[PDB]
Amino acid sequence: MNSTGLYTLLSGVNRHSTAIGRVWLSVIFIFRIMVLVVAAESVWGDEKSSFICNTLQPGCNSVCYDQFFPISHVRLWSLQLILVSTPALLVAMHVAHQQHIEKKMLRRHKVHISGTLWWTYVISVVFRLLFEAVFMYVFYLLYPGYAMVRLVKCDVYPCPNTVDCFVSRPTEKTVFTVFMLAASGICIILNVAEVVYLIIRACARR
């Protein structure tokens, strides 16, 4: 259960929770992690030798794959996963530091400590939402369509003439792309909802 515990900690939302981050956001995060693991291992796999171009010239396949796929889908997904996880790690380290300060004191102010923890948690949720939105926009920029292309025409050096060539598995890649963007959209919606509900609860407290 160490993997599940770590994944929960990546959306732990510490003490100040809205029953949205702990239940729904955590499960969506774990689901996205599992889908990304499956896709990266099996579907994309190597994604370099699986790209075949109808050429005898050495190096034309590499440059042709580079031109159309500057960064892989799985690479962006893993990078987004790491950057989304980082605010949660910041909050966990901050709460551990605060607990250590409390135990050092043991060996008004508590209200201020709780307020600071709440503020840092809210800021981290906002930053997570911003990272998700930015990566969604980056995916839109680099890969407009949700479907993976099947045929591409290449004329870049050192390819002598224009050559047509093929992506490995467009259908599975399209399915996993739809899954990943659906999970990202659900995460964005849940993050916005959690921010709004946190603000409402804070206003109700005052």
Q: From the CB of 139, what's the least distance to a second copy, in Å? A: 14
Q: From the CB of 21, what's the least distance to a second copy, in Å? A: 10
CA 49, CA 71: separation in Å to the nearest integer? 16
φ, ψ of residue 155 to 5 degrees: the values are: -135, 10
- The sheet with strand 52-53 has its strands ordered as 52-53, 163-166, 151-154
Alpha helices in the chain (DSSP H): 2-9, 26-38, 60-68, 73-106, 109-142, 170-205
If the CB atoms of residues 62 and 201 are measured against a second copy, the closer one turns out to be: 62
For 40, 142, 149, 169, the CA distances from 68, given in Å and listed in that order, are 19, 9, 10, 15
Q: From the CB of 129, what's the least distance to a second copy, in Å? A: 19
If the CB atoms of residues 35 and 125 are measured against a second copy, the closer one turns out to be: 35
If the CB atoms of residues 71 and 134 are measured against a second copy, the closer one turns out to be: 71
φ, ψ of residue 5 to 5 degrees: the values are: -65, -45
Query: Which residues form the interface with a second copy (CB under 8 A)?
Result: 1-6, 8-9, 17, 19, 22-24, 26-27, 30-31, 34-35, 38, 40, 42-43, 48, 50, 52-54, 57-59, 62-63, 66, 70-72, 74-75, 78-79, 82, 86, 89-90, 93-94, 96-97, 100, 150, 158, 164-166, 168-172, 175, 179
If the CB atoms of residues 94 and 126 are measured against a second copy, the closer one turns out to be: 94
